[PDB]
């Protein structure tokens, strides 16, 4: 299959006007970056509802992954599940992003835009979906195989999933945050993969990316200690080839320079009083 090129973007999907928009919608920037890392009990409970709903939207768009389907079509299914459940799609109008999820085929690392692109047999596609409901966000993504995927690509997907889950199972209060990126990177390196450094996980709460940064590679200079009530994502991008990338002129789509494929999984995590809870399960 040849290297991807930009497809054609369908017009802005509407969302019912009664659904509250995040503040950043239709503005050039978002007011985020300086919010508290530890959330209130109320915000946490609200994030469980946002997380469930984004998990539902993700599993529904993933069902439609099949040779012949377009990315635009995955967006539509995800959009429709968020809206039917009262959530705003956080990606929509975030810094000018035009769709309700990111769709990231094969050599696209992240931030791909749903479009006329038709999925072909053997492809892998990441769907990344975020829900905003009750003044809070819930963020989750996953890579789905399309028909008959080559063994090297199934293993990549399976091992990216496993890295992500291993990292999550280390989350506990009083443990250093740098532990996550140690675990992910050892695991990736074990099988010859390379972890994307330039994109990271993030704190998330009443804002989308609240200023907390979770590195997916080994960086022990970070002194952040996990505390009960902290909410963040773990979202590692793992490459078969080299880490160098380019961005499309749409300004969002990141693609591996060598055009080798790449995969990603994401959950939204709560640090509990003794451990972790995954907020983006069905
Ligand atoms: C184009 S919206 S910013 C990246 C999308 C994703 N939901 C994330 O931040 O994990
Ligand atoms: Co995220
Ligand atoms: Co995401």
Curated annotation (Swiss-Prot):
Removes the N-terminal methionine from nascent proteins. The N-terminal methionine is often cleaved when the second residue in the primary sequence is small and uncharged (Met-Ala-, Cys, Gly, Pro, Ser, Thr, or Val). Requires deformylation of the N(alpha)-formylated initiator methionine before it can be hydrolyzed. One of its GO terms (biological process) is proteolysis. This is Methionine aminopeptidase 2. Belongs to the peptidase M24A family. Methionine aminopeptidase type 1 subfamily. Its cofactor is Co(2+); Zn(2+); Mn(2+); Fe(2+). One of its GO terms (cellular component) is cytosol. One of its GO terms (molecular function) is initiator methionyl aminopeptidase activity. It catalyses: Release of N-terminal amino acids, preferentially methionine, from peptides and arylamides. Its EC number is 3.4.11.18. A divalent metal cation 1 binds at residues 128, 139, 266. It comes from Mycobacterium tuberculosis (strain CDC 1551 / Oshkosh). It comes from the Bacteria. Keywords: Aminopeptidase, Hydrolase, Metal-binding, Protease. The gene is map. It holds the Pfam family Peptidase_M24. The keyword Protease applies. Binds 2 divalent metal cations per subunit. Has a high-affinity and a low affinity metal-binding site. The true nature of the physiological cofactor is under debate. The enzyme is active with cobalt, zinc, manganese or divalent iron ions. Most likely, methionine aminopeptidases function as mononuclear Fe(2+)-metalloproteases under physiological conditions, and the catalytically relevant metal-binding site has been assigned to the histidine-containing high-affinity site. A divalent metal cation 2 binds at residues 139, 202, 235, 266. InterPro entries: Creatinase/aminopeptidase-like, Pept_M24, Pept_M24_MAP, Pept_M24A_MAP1. Monomer. Substrate binds at residues 111, 209.
């Amino acid at each position: 299959r040849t290297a991807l090129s930009p497809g054609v973007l369908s017009p802005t999907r509407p969302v019912p006007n009664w659904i509250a928009r995040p503040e950043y919608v239709g503005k050039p920037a978002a007011q985020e970056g300086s919010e508290p890392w530890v959330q209130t009990p109320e915000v946490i409970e609200k994030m469980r509802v946002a997380g469930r709903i984004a998990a539902g939207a993700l599993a529904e768009a993933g069902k439609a992954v099949a040779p012949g389907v377009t990315t635009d079509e995955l967006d539509r299914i995800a959009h429709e599940y968020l809206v039917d459940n009262g959530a705003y799609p956080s990606t929509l109008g975030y810094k000018g992003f035009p769709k309700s999820c990111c769709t990231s085929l094969n050599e696209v690392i992240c931030h791909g835009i749903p479009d006329s692109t038709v999925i072909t047999d053997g492809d892998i596609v990441n769907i990344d979906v975020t829900a905003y409901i009750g003044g809070v966000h819930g963020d989750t993504n996953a890579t789905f195989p399309a028909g008959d995927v080559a063994d090297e690509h199934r293993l990549l997907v399976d091992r990216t999933r496993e890295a992500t889950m291993r990292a999550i199972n280390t989350v506990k209060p009083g443990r250093a945050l740098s532990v996550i990126g140690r675990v992910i990177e050892s695991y990736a390196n074990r099988f010859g993969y390379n972890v994307v450094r330039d994109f990271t996980g993030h704190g998330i709460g009443t804002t989308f990316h609240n200023g907390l940064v979770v590195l997916h590679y080994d960086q022990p200079a970070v002194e952040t200690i996990m505390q009960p009530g902290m909410t963040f994502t773990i979202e590692p991008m793992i490459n078969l080839g080299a880490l160098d990338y380019e961005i499309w002129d749409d300004g969002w789509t990141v693609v591996t320079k060598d055009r080798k494929w790449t995969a990603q999984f994401e959950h939204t995590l709560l640090v509990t009083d003794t451990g972790v809870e995954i907020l983006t399960c069905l």
